[PDB]
Amino acid sequence: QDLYPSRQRADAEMRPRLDPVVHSEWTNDAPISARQAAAFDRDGYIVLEDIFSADEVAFLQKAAGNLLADPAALDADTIVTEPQSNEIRSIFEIHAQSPVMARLAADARLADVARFLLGDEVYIHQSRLNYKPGFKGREFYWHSDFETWHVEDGMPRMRALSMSVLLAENTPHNGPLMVIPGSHRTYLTCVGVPDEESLAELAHRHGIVAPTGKPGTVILFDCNLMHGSNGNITPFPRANAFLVYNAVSNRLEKPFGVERPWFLARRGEPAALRVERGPLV
Ligand SMILES: [Fe+3]
Structure with a gap:
Protein backbone atom coordinates (compact mmCIF):
# COMPACT_ATOMS: atom_id res chain seq x y z
CA GLN A 1 0.00 0.00 0.00
CA ASP A 2 2.57 2.56 1.18
CA LEU A 3 5.75 1.15 -0.37
CA TYR A 4 7.83 4.15 0.79
CA PRO A 5 6.81 5.17 4.29
CA SER A 6 8.50 8.20 5.84
CA ARG A 7 7.74 10.72 8.66
CA GLN A 8 6.21 8.02 10.96
CA ARG A 9 8.98 6.54 13.11
CA ALA A 10 11.33 8.73 15.20
CA ASP A 11 14.59 7.15 13.84
CA ALA A 12 15.78 7.35 10.22
CA GLU A 13 15.97 4.35 7.90
CA MET A 14 17.71 3.60 4.66
CA ARG A 15 15.17 1.38 2.84
CA PRO A 16 15.91 -0.27 -0.50
CA ARG A 17 14.47 1.03 -3.83
CA LEU A 18 11.50 -1.08 -5.07
CA ASP A 19 11.08 0.49 -8.54
CA PRO A 20 13.32 0.34 -11.60
CA VAL A 21 15.33 3.40 -12.36
CA VAL A 22 15.18 2.97 -16.17
CA HIS A 23 11.63 1.73 -17.04
CA ARG A 35 25.84 3.98 -22.21
CA GLN A 36 23.74 7.05 -21.32
CA ALA A 37 20.85 4.83 -20.29
CA ALA A 38 23.26 2.80 -18.13
CA ALA A 39 24.73 5.90 -16.57
CA PHE A 40 21.24 7.05 -15.65
CA ASP A 41 20.43 3.77 -14.01
CA ARG A 42 23.71 3.62 -12.14
CA ASP A 43 24.18 7.31 -11.18
CA GLY A 44 20.60 8.54 -11.19
CA GLU A 56 17.08 28.56 -29.40
CA VAL A 57 19.21 29.12 -26.27
CA ALA A 58 19.15 32.92 -26.81
CA PHE A 59 15.40 32.63 -27.42
CA LEU A 60 14.77 30.73 -24.16
CA GLN A 61 17.05 33.11 -22.28
CA LYS A 62 15.32 36.15 -23.77
CA ALA A 63 11.91 34.63 -22.88
CA ALA A 64 12.81 33.82 -19.25
CA GLY A 65 14.08 37.33 -18.79
CA ASN A 66 10.63 38.64 -19.84
CA LEU A 67 8.73 36.33 -17.49
CA LEU A 68 10.97 37.28 -14.62
CA ALA A 69 10.62 41.01 -15.27
CA ASP A 70 6.83 40.91 -15.58
CA PRO A 71 5.04 39.53 -12.48
CA ALA A 72 1.94 41.65 -13.16
CA ALA A 73 1.24 39.33 -16.11
CA LEU A 74 1.06 36.14 -14.05
CA ASP A 75 -0.87 34.31 -11.46
CA ALA A 76 0.18 35.77 -8.09
CA ASP A 77 -0.24 32.37 -6.39
CA THR A 78 2.74 31.09 -8.44
CA ILE A 79 5.28 33.80 -7.57
CA VAL A 80 8.13 33.42 -5.04
CA THR A 81 10.04 36.40 -3.75
CA GLU A 82 12.79 37.96 -1.71
CA PRO A 83 10.83 38.78 1.49
CA GLN A 84 11.47 41.70 2.12
CA SER A 85 12.81 43.33 -1.08
CA ASN A 86 10.54 42.73 -4.09
CA GLU A 87 12.73 40.37 -6.11
CA ILE A 88 11.34 37.47 -8.17
CA ARG A 89 13.06 34.24 -7.18
CA SER A 90 10.83 31.46 -8.61
CA ILE A 91 7.75 31.20 -10.82
CA PHE A 92 5.74 27.93 -10.60
CA GLU A 93 3.52 26.47 -13.33
CA ILE A 94 5.41 28.25 -16.11
CA HIS A 95 4.52 25.39 -18.36
CA ALA A 96 0.85 26.47 -18.19
CA GLN A 97 1.51 30.24 -18.03
CA SER A 98 4.19 30.48 -20.72
CA PRO A 99 3.49 29.31 -24.25
CA VAL A 100 7.26 29.25 -24.83
CA MET A 101 8.02 27.11 -21.78
CA ALA A 102 4.94 25.05 -22.60
CA ARG A 103 6.60 24.33 -25.96
CA LEU A 104 9.90 23.61 -24.22
CA ALA A 105 8.35 20.91 -21.99
CA ALA A 106 6.83 19.31 -25.09
CA ASP A 107 9.97 19.33 -27.22
CA ALA A 108 10.85 15.82 -28.38
CA ARG A 109 14.47 16.21 -27.41
CA LEU A 110 13.23 16.35 -23.78
CA ALA A 111 9.86 14.57 -23.78
CA ASP A 112 11.07 11.55 -25.76
CA VAL A 113 13.93 11.02 -23.32
CA ALA A 114 11.41 11.15 -20.45
CA ARG A 115 8.96 8.71 -22.09
CA PHE A 116 11.84 6.29 -22.65
CA LEU A 117 13.36 6.59 -19.16
CA LEU A 118 9.95 6.58 -17.52
CA GLY A 119 8.79 3.85 -19.94
CA ASP A 120 5.40 5.51 -20.41
CA GLU A 121 3.54 8.55 -21.68
CA VAL A 122 4.19 11.53 -19.40
CA TYR A 123 2.80 14.76 -18.02
CA ILE A 124 4.35 17.65 -16.04
CA HIS A 125 4.03 17.17 -12.30
CA GLN A 126 5.59 20.57 -11.67
CA SER A 127 7.51 23.28 -13.47
CA ARG A 128 9.62 26.26 -12.33
CA LEU A 129 11.46 29.16 -13.77
CA ASN A 130 14.28 29.98 -11.27
CA TYR A 131 16.55 32.95 -10.74
CA LYS A 132 19.19 32.83 -8.00
CA PRO A 133 20.93 36.28 -8.17
CA GLY A 134 24.61 36.96 -7.47
CA PHE A 135 25.99 37.99 -4.06
CA LYS A 136 23.01 36.94 -2.00
CA GLY A 137 22.02 33.52 -3.26
CA ARG A 138 20.74 31.01 -0.71
CA GLU A 139 21.76 27.41 -0.24
CA PHE A 140 19.16 24.73 -0.89
CA TYR A 141 19.88 21.93 1.63
CA TRP A 142 20.10 18.24 0.74
CA HIS A 143 16.76 16.54 0.01
CA SER A 144 15.07 13.90 -2.06
CA ASP A 145 12.26 15.31 -4.17
CA PHE A 146 10.42 11.99 -4.11
CA GLU A 147 10.28 11.77 -0.32
CA THR A 148 8.21 14.98 -0.39
CA TRP A 149 6.26 14.11 -3.53
CA HIS A 150 5.22 10.84 -1.92
CA VAL A 151 4.47 12.07 1.55
CA GLU A 152 3.06 15.49 0.78
CA ASP A 153 1.68 14.96 -2.74
CA GLY A 154 0.76 11.29 -3.01
CA MET A 155 3.20 10.37 -5.79
CA PRO A 156 3.22 6.61 -5.15
CA ARG A 157 6.23 5.20 -7.09
CA MET A 158 9.71 6.31 -7.99
CA ARG A 159 8.62 6.82 -11.59
CA ALA A 160 9.45 10.46 -12.34
CA LEU A 161 12.36 12.61 -13.28
CA SER A 162 13.42 16.30 -13.05
CA MET A 163 14.97 18.22 -15.92
CA SER A 164 16.92 21.33 -15.32
CA VAL A 165 17.52 23.44 -18.42
CA LEU A 166 20.38 25.84 -17.62
CA LEU A 167 19.86 29.43 -18.78
CA ALA A 168 22.77 31.13 -17.17
CA GLU A 169 26.17 29.54 -16.94
CA ASN A 170 26.90 27.18 -14.01
CA THR A 171 30.61 27.47 -13.09
CA PRO A 172 31.81 25.45 -10.22
CA HIS A 173 31.85 28.68 -8.25
CA ASN A 174 28.22 29.94 -8.12
CA GLY A 175 26.45 27.17 -6.17
CA PRO A 176 25.66 24.71 -8.93
CA LEU A 177 23.31 21.83 -8.19
CA HIS A 184 18.63 7.24 -5.86
CA ARG A 185 18.79 3.45 -4.97
CA THR A 186 18.33 4.15 -1.24
CA TYR A 187 15.19 5.65 0.16
CA LEU A 188 16.22 7.69 3.15
CA THR A 189 13.29 8.18 5.51
CA CYS A 190 12.92 11.46 7.37
CA VAL A 191 11.90 11.86 11.09
CA GLY A 192 11.01 16.63 6.07
CA VAL A 193 14.81 17.06 6.13
CA PRO A 194 17.29 14.20 5.84
CA ASP A 195 19.66 13.76 8.79
CA GLU A 196 23.38 14.44 9.07
CA GLU A 197 24.60 10.88 9.77
CA SER A 198 22.72 9.36 6.89
CA LEU A 199 23.89 12.14 4.60
CA ALA A 200 27.51 11.63 5.65
CA GLU A 201 27.10 7.91 5.05
CA LEU A 202 25.80 8.41 1.49
CA ALA A 203 28.46 10.95 0.59
CA HIS A 204 31.26 8.77 1.94
CA ARG A 205 30.08 5.72 0.01
CA HIS A 206 29.30 7.64 -3.24
CA GLY A 207 31.00 11.02 -3.33
CA ILE A 208 29.63 14.25 -4.71
CA VAL A 209 29.44 15.65 -8.23
CA ALA A 210 28.24 19.03 -9.33
CA PRO A 211 27.73 19.01 -13.04
CA THR A 212 28.35 22.31 -14.87
CA GLY A 213 27.53 23.53 -18.39
CA LYS A 214 26.83 26.43 -20.74
CA PRO A 215 23.29 27.78 -21.14
CA GLY A 216 21.00 25.24 -22.80
CA THR A 217 22.62 22.26 -21.16
CA VAL A 218 20.13 19.88 -19.63
CA ILE A 219 20.64 17.98 -16.35
CA LEU A 220 18.18 15.09 -15.84
CA PHE A 221 17.84 13.29 -12.53
CA ASP A 222 15.80 10.59 -10.95
CA CYS A 223 13.05 11.85 -8.55
CA ASN A 224 14.82 10.26 -5.53
CA LEU A 225 18.39 11.46 -6.19
CA MET A 226 19.73 13.20 -3.09
CA HIS A 227 20.77 16.69 -4.09
CA GLY A 228 21.25 20.32 -3.15
CA SER A 229 23.46 23.34 -3.57
CA ASN A 230 25.66 25.87 -1.80
CA GLY A 231 24.87 29.56 -1.75
CA ASN A 232 26.52 31.93 -4.15
CA ILE A 233 28.50 35.04 -3.25
CA THR A 234 29.67 35.41 -6.88
CA PRO A 235 28.40 38.14 -9.23
CA PHE A 236 27.25 35.34 -11.56
CA PRO A 237 23.61 34.44 -11.26
CA ARG A 238 22.01 31.04 -11.61
CA ALA A 239 18.90 30.61 -13.72
CA ASN A 240 17.23 27.46 -15.01
CA ALA A 241 13.87 26.13 -16.14
CA PHE A 242 12.94 23.15 -13.93
CA LEU A 243 10.63 20.51 -15.41
CA VAL A 244 9.37 17.43 -13.56
CA TYR A 245 8.05 14.60 -15.74
CA ASN A 246 5.86 11.89 -14.29
CA ALA A 247 4.53 8.74 -15.91
CA VAL A 248 0.74 9.04 -16.44
CA SER A 249 0.33 5.61 -14.87
CA ASN A 250 2.05 7.05 -11.76
CA ARG A 251 -0.62 9.70 -11.12
CA LEU A 252 -1.07 11.19 -7.63
CA GLU A 253 -3.21 9.66 -4.93
CA LYS A 254 -4.08 11.00 -1.51
CA PRO A 255 -0.86 12.01 0.32
CA PHE A 256 1.02 9.33 2.27
CA GLY A 257 0.86 11.62 5.31
CA VAL A 258 -1.56 14.17 6.84
CA GLU A 259 -2.83 16.80 4.21
CA ARG A 260 -0.61 21.11 -0.83
CA PRO A 261 -1.22 24.14 -3.18
CA TRP A 262 -2.20 23.27 -6.79
CA PHE A 263 0.81 25.02 -8.37
CA LEU A 264 3.29 22.67 -6.62
CA ALA A 265 1.67 19.53 -8.09
CA ARG A 266 -0.93 18.58 -10.69
CA ARG A 267 -3.14 16.57 -8.26
CA GLY A 268 -5.70 16.08 -11.09
CA GLU A 269 -6.44 12.94 -13.25
CA PRO A 270 -4.23 14.29 -16.02
CA ALA A 271 -3.47 13.38 -19.62
CA ALA A 272 -0.46 12.68 -21.84
CA LEU A 273 1.63 15.58 -22.97
CA ARG A 274 1.74 15.78 -26.77
CA VAL A 275 5.27 15.73 -28.11
CA GLU A 276 6.21 18.56 -30.59
CA ARG A 277 9.26 18.24 -32.96
CA GLY A 278 11.40 20.73 -34.87
CA PRO A 279 13.12 23.88 -33.59
CA LEU A 280 11.73 26.41 -31.13
CA VAL A 281 12.24 29.54 -33.24
FE1 LIG B 1 14.75 19.72 -5.78
Missing part, protein backbone atom coordinates in the same frame (compact mmCIF):
# COMPACT_ATOMS: atom_id res chain seq x y z
CA SER A 24 12.41 0.64 -20.69
CA GLU A 25 14.57 -1.88 -22.52
CA TRP A 26 17.22 -0.15 -24.59
CA THR A 27 17.32 -0.58 -28.39
CA ASN A 28 18.44 1.46 -31.39
CA ASP A 29 15.08 3.26 -31.25
CA ALA A 30 15.90 4.94 -27.96
CA PRO A 31 16.56 8.71 -27.98
CA ILE A 32 19.72 8.05 -26.00
CA SER A 33 22.75 5.80 -26.22
CA ALA A 34 23.06 2.49 -24.37
CA TYR A 45 21.44 11.48 -13.44
CA ILE A 46 22.93 12.38 -16.84
CA VAL A 47 23.87 15.64 -18.61
CA LEU A 48 22.65 16.52 -22.20
CA GLU A 49 24.87 18.97 -24.11
CA ASP A 50 24.47 20.78 -27.40
CA ILE A 51 20.85 19.75 -28.04
CA PHE A 52 19.51 23.27 -28.58
CA SER A 53 21.07 25.68 -31.16
CA ALA A 54 22.60 29.04 -30.24
CA ASP A 55 19.41 30.80 -31.37
CA MET A 178 25.22 19.06 -6.40
CA VAL A 179 24.37 15.33 -6.40
CA ILE A 180 25.30 12.17 -4.63
CA PRO A 181 25.55 9.60 -7.46
CA GLY A 182 23.87 6.29 -6.61
CA SER A 183 21.78 7.84 -3.79
Whole structure:
Protein backbone atom coordinates (compact mmCIF):
# COMPACT_ATOMS: atom_id res chain seq x y z
CA GLN A 1 0.00 0.00 0.00
CA ASP A 2 2.57 2.56 1.18
CA LEU A 3 5.75 1.15 -0.37
CA TYR A 4 7.83 4.15 0.79
CA PRO A 5 6.81 5.17 4.29
CA SER A 6 8.50 8.20 5.84
CA ARG A 7 7.74 10.72 8.66
CA GLN A 8 6.21 8.02 10.96
CA ARG A 9 8.98 6.54 13.11
CA ALA A 10 11.33 8.73 15.20
CA ASP A 11 14.59 7.15 13.84
CA ALA A 12 15.78 7.35 10.22
CA GLU A 13 15.97 4.35 7.90
CA MET A 14 17.71 3.60 4.66
CA ARG A 15 15.17 1.38 2.84
CA PRO A 16 15.91 -0.27 -0.50
CA ARG A 17 14.47 1.03 -3.83
CA LEU A 18 11.50 -1.08 -5.07
CA ASP A 19 11.08 0.49 -8.54
CA PRO A 20 13.32 0.34 -11.60
CA VAL A 21 15.33 3.40 -12.36
CA VAL A 22 15.18 2.97 -16.17
CA HIS A 23 11.63 1.73 -17.04
CA SER A 24 12.41 0.64 -20.69
CA GLU A 25 14.57 -1.88 -22.52
CA TRP A 26 17.22 -0.15 -24.59
CA THR A 27 17.32 -0.58 -28.39
CA ASN A 28 18.44 1.46 -31.39
CA ASP A 29 15.08 3.26 -31.25
CA ALA A 30 15.90 4.94 -27.96
CA PRO A 31 16.56 8.71 -27.98
CA ILE A 32 19.72 8.05 -26.00
CA SER A 33 22.75 5.80 -26.22
CA ALA A 34 23.06 2.49 -24.37
CA ARG A 35 25.84 3.98 -22.21
CA GLN A 36 23.74 7.05 -21.32
CA ALA A 37 20.85 4.83 -20.29
CA ALA A 38 23.26 2.80 -18.13
CA ALA A 39 24.73 5.90 -16.57
CA PHE A 40 21.24 7.05 -15.65
CA ASP A 41 20.43 3.77 -14.01
CA ARG A 42 23.71 3.62 -12.14
CA ASP A 43 24.18 7.31 -11.18
CA GLY A 44 20.60 8.54 -11.19
CA TYR A 45 21.44 11.48 -13.44
CA ILE A 46 22.93 12.38 -16.84
CA VAL A 47 23.87 15.64 -18.61
CA LEU A 48 22.65 16.52 -22.20
CA GLU A 49 24.87 18.97 -24.11
CA ASP A 50 24.47 20.78 -27.40
CA ILE A 51 20.85 19.75 -28.04
CA PHE A 52 19.51 23.27 -28.58
CA SER A 53 21.07 25.68 -31.16
CA ALA A 54 22.60 29.04 -30.24
CA ASP A 55 19.41 30.80 -31.37
CA GLU A 56 17.08 28.56 -29.40
CA VAL A 57 19.21 29.12 -26.27
CA ALA A 58 19.15 32.92 -26.81
CA PHE A 59 15.40 32.63 -27.42
CA LEU A 60 14.77 30.73 -24.16
CA GLN A 61 17.05 33.11 -22.28
CA LYS A 62 15.32 36.15 -23.77
CA ALA A 63 11.91 34.63 -22.88
CA ALA A 64 12.81 33.82 -19.25
CA GLY A 65 14.08 37.33 -18.79
CA ASN A 66 10.63 38.64 -19.84
CA LEU A 67 8.73 36.33 -17.49
CA LEU A 68 10.97 37.28 -14.62
CA ALA A 69 10.62 41.01 -15.27
CA ASP A 70 6.83 40.91 -15.58
CA PRO A 71 5.04 39.53 -12.48
CA ALA A 72 1.94 41.65 -13.16
CA ALA A 73 1.24 39.33 -16.11
CA LEU A 74 1.06 36.14 -14.05
CA ASP A 75 -0.87 34.31 -11.46
CA ALA A 76 0.18 35.77 -8.09
CA ASP A 77 -0.24 32.37 -6.39
CA THR A 78 2.74 31.09 -8.44
CA ILE A 79 5.28 33.80 -7.57
CA VAL A 80 8.13 33.42 -5.04
CA THR A 81 10.04 36.40 -3.75
CA GLU A 82 12.79 37.96 -1.71
CA PRO A 83 10.83 38.78 1.49
CA GLN A 84 11.47 41.70 2.12
CA SER A 85 12.81 43.33 -1.08
CA ASN A 86 10.54 42.73 -4.09
CA GLU A 87 12.73 40.37 -6.11
CA ILE A 88 11.34 37.47 -8.17
CA ARG A 89 13.06 34.24 -7.18
CA SER A 90 10.83 31.46 -8.61
CA ILE A 91 7.75 31.20 -10.82
CA PHE A 92 5.74 27.93 -10.60
CA GLU A 93 3.52 26.47 -13.33
CA ILE A 94 5.41 28.25 -16.11
CA HIS A 95 4.52 25.39 -18.36
CA ALA A 96 0.85 26.47 -18.19
CA GLN A 97 1.51 30.24 -18.03
CA SER A 98 4.19 30.48 -20.72
CA PRO A 99 3.49 29.31 -24.25
CA VAL A 100 7.26 29.25 -24.83
CA MET A 101 8.02 27.11 -21.78
CA ALA A 102 4.94 25.05 -22.60
CA ARG A 103 6.60 24.33 -25.96
CA LEU A 104 9.90 23.61 -24.22
CA ALA A 105 8.35 20.91 -21.99
CA ALA A 106 6.83 19.31 -25.09
CA ASP A 107 9.97 19.33 -27.22
CA ALA A 108 10.85 15.82 -28.38
CA ARG A 109 14.47 16.21 -27.41
CA LEU A 110 13.23 16.35 -23.78
CA ALA A 111 9.86 14.57 -23.78
CA ASP A 112 11.07 11.55 -25.76
CA VAL A 113 13.93 11.02 -23.32
CA ALA A 114 11.41 11.15 -20.45
CA ARG A 115 8.96 8.71 -22.09
CA PHE A 116 11.84 6.29 -22.65
CA LEU A 117 13.36 6.59 -19.16
CA LEU A 118 9.95 6.58 -17.52
CA GLY A 119 8.79 3.85 -19.94
CA ASP A 120 5.40 5.51 -20.41
CA GLU A 121 3.54 8.55 -21.68
CA VAL A 122 4.19 11.53 -19.40
CA TYR A 123 2.80 14.76 -18.02
CA ILE A 124 4.35 17.65 -16.04
CA HIS A 125 4.03 17.17 -12.30
CA GLN A 126 5.59 20.57 -11.67
CA SER A 127 7.51 23.28 -13.47
CA ARG A 128 9.62 26.26 -12.33
CA LEU A 129 11.46 29.16 -13.77
CA ASN A 130 14.28 29.98 -11.27
CA TYR A 131 16.55 32.95 -10.74
CA LYS A 132 19.19 32.83 -8.00
CA PRO A 133 20.93 36.28 -8.17
CA GLY A 134 24.61 36.96 -7.47
CA PHE A 135 25.99 37.99 -4.06
CA LYS A 136 23.01 36.94 -2.00
CA GLY A 137 22.02 33.52 -3.26
CA ARG A 138 20.74 31.01 -0.71
CA GLU A 139 21.76 27.41 -0.24
CA PHE A 140 19.16 24.73 -0.89
CA TYR A 141 19.88 21.93 1.63
CA TRP A 142 20.10 18.24 0.74
CA HIS A 143 16.76 16.54 0.01
CA SER A 144 15.07 13.90 -2.06
CA ASP A 145 12.26 15.31 -4.17
CA PHE A 146 10.42 11.99 -4.11
CA GLU A 147 10.28 11.77 -0.32
CA THR A 148 8.21 14.98 -0.39
CA TRP A 149 6.26 14.11 -3.53
CA HIS A 150 5.22 10.84 -1.92
CA VAL A 151 4.47 12.07 1.55
CA GLU A 152 3.06 15.49 0.78
CA ASP A 153 1.68 14.96 -2.74
CA GLY A 154 0.76 11.29 -3.01
CA MET A 155 3.20 10.37 -5.79
CA PRO A 156 3.22 6.61 -5.15
CA ARG A 157 6.23 5.20 -7.09
CA MET A 158 9.71 6.31 -7.99
CA ARG A 159 8.62 6.82 -11.59
CA ALA A 160 9.45 10.46 -12.34
CA LEU A 161 12.36 12.61 -13.28
CA SER A 162 13.42 16.30 -13.05
CA MET A 163 14.97 18.22 -15.92
CA SER A 164 16.92 21.33 -15.32
CA VAL A 165 17.52 23.44 -18.42
CA LEU A 166 20.38 25.84 -17.62
CA LEU A 167 19.86 29.43 -18.78
CA ALA A 168 22.77 31.13 -17.17
CA GLU A 169 26.17 29.54 -16.94
CA ASN A 170 26.90 27.18 -14.01
CA THR A 171 30.61 27.47 -13.09
CA PRO A 172 31.81 25.45 -10.22
CA HIS A 173 31.85 28.68 -8.25
CA ASN A 174 28.22 29.94 -8.12
CA GLY A 175 26.45 27.17 -6.17
CA PRO A 176 25.66 24.71 -8.93
CA LEU A 177 23.31 21.83 -8.19
CA MET A 178 25.22 19.06 -6.40
CA VAL A 179 24.37 15.33 -6.40
CA ILE A 180 25.30 12.17 -4.63
CA PRO A 181 25.55 9.60 -7.46
CA GLY A 182 23.87 6.29 -6.61
CA SER A 183 21.78 7.84 -3.79
CA HIS A 184 18.63 7.24 -5.86
CA ARG A 185 18.79 3.45 -4.97
CA THR A 186 18.33 4.15 -1.24
CA TYR A 187 15.19 5.65 0.16
CA LEU A 188 16.22 7.69 3.15
CA THR A 189 13.29 8.18 5.51
CA CYS A 190 12.92 11.46 7.37
CA VAL A 191 11.90 11.86 11.09
CA GLY A 192 11.01 16.63 6.07
CA VAL A 193 14.81 17.06 6.13
CA PRO A 194 17.29 14.20 5.84
CA ASP A 195 19.66 13.76 8.79
CA GLU A 196 23.38 14.44 9.07
CA GLU A 197 24.60 10.88 9.77
CA SER A 198 22.72 9.36 6.89
CA LEU A 199 23.89 12.14 4.60
CA ALA A 200 27.51 11.63 5.65
CA GLU A 201 27.10 7.91 5.05
CA LEU A 202 25.80 8.41 1.49
CA ALA A 203 28.46 10.95 0.59
CA HIS A 204 31.26 8.77 1.94
CA ARG A 205 30.08 5.72 0.01
CA HIS A 206 29.30 7.64 -3.24
CA GLY A 207 31.00 11.02 -3.33
CA ILE A 208 29.63 14.25 -4.71
CA VAL A 209 29.44 15.65 -8.23
CA ALA A 210 28.24 19.03 -9.33
CA PRO A 211 27.73 19.01 -13.04
CA THR A 212 28.35 22.31 -14.87
CA GLY A 213 27.53 23.53 -18.39
CA LYS A 214 26.83 26.43 -20.74
CA PRO A 215 23.29 27.78 -21.14
CA GLY A 216 21.00 25.24 -22.80
CA THR A 217 22.62 22.26 -21.16
CA VAL A 218 20.13 19.88 -19.63
CA ILE A 219 20.64 17.98 -16.35
CA LEU A 220 18.18 15.09 -15.84
CA PHE A 221 17.84 13.29 -12.53
CA ASP A 222 15.80 10.59 -10.95
CA CYS A 223 13.05 11.85 -8.55
CA ASN A 224 14.82 10.26 -5.53
CA LEU A 225 18.39 11.46 -6.19
CA MET A 226 19.73 13.20 -3.09
CA HIS A 227 20.77 16.69 -4.09
CA GLY A 228 21.25 20.32 -3.15
CA SER A 229 23.46 23.34 -3.57
CA ASN A 230 25.66 25.87 -1.80
CA GLY A 231 24.87 29.56 -1.75
CA ASN A 232 26.52 31.93 -4.15
CA ILE A 233 28.50 35.04 -3.25
CA THR A 234 29.67 35.41 -6.88
CA PRO A 235 28.40 38.14 -9.23
CA PHE A 236 27.25 35.34 -11.56
CA PRO A 237 23.61 34.44 -11.26
CA ARG A 238 22.01 31.04 -11.61
CA ALA A 239 18.90 30.61 -13.72
CA ASN A 240 17.23 27.46 -15.01
CA ALA A 241 13.87 26.13 -16.14
CA PHE A 242 12.94 23.15 -13.93
CA LEU A 243 10.63 20.51 -15.41
CA VAL A 244 9.37 17.43 -13.56
CA TYR A 245 8.05 14.60 -15.74
CA ASN A 246 5.86 11.89 -14.29
CA ALA A 247 4.53 8.74 -15.91
CA VAL A 248 0.74 9.04 -16.44
CA SER A 249 0.33 5.61 -14.87
CA ASN A 250 2.05 7.05 -11.76
CA ARG A 251 -0.62 9.70 -11.12
CA LEU A 252 -1.07 11.19 -7.63
CA GLU A 253 -3.21 9.66 -4.93
CA LYS A 254 -4.08 11.00 -1.51
CA PRO A 255 -0.86 12.01 0.32
CA PHE A 256 1.02 9.33 2.27
CA GLY A 257 0.86 11.62 5.31
CA VAL A 258 -1.56 14.17 6.84
CA GLU A 259 -2.83 16.80 4.21
CA ARG A 260 -0.61 21.11 -0.83
CA PRO A 261 -1.22 24.14 -3.18
CA TRP A 262 -2.20 23.27 -6.79
CA PHE A 263 0.81 25.02 -8.37
CA LEU A 264 3.29 22.67 -6.62
CA ALA A 265 1.67 19.53 -8.09
CA ARG A 266 -0.93 18.58 -10.69
CA ARG A 267 -3.14 16.57 -8.26
CA GLY A 268 -5.70 16.08 -11.09
CA GLU A 269 -6.44 12.94 -13.25
CA PRO A 270 -4.23 14.29 -16.02
CA ALA A 271 -3.47 13.38 -19.62
CA ALA A 272 -0.46 12.68 -21.84
CA LEU A 273 1.63 15.58 -22.97
CA ARG A 274 1.74 15.78 -26.77
CA VAL A 275 5.27 15.73 -28.11
CA GLU A 276 6.21 18.56 -30.59
CA ARG A 277 9.26 18.24 -32.96
CA GLY A 278 11.40 20.73 -34.87
CA PRO A 279 13.12 23.88 -33.59
CA LEU A 280 11.73 26.41 -31.13
CA VAL A 281 12.24 29.54 -33.24
FE1 LIG B 1 14.75 19.72 -5.78
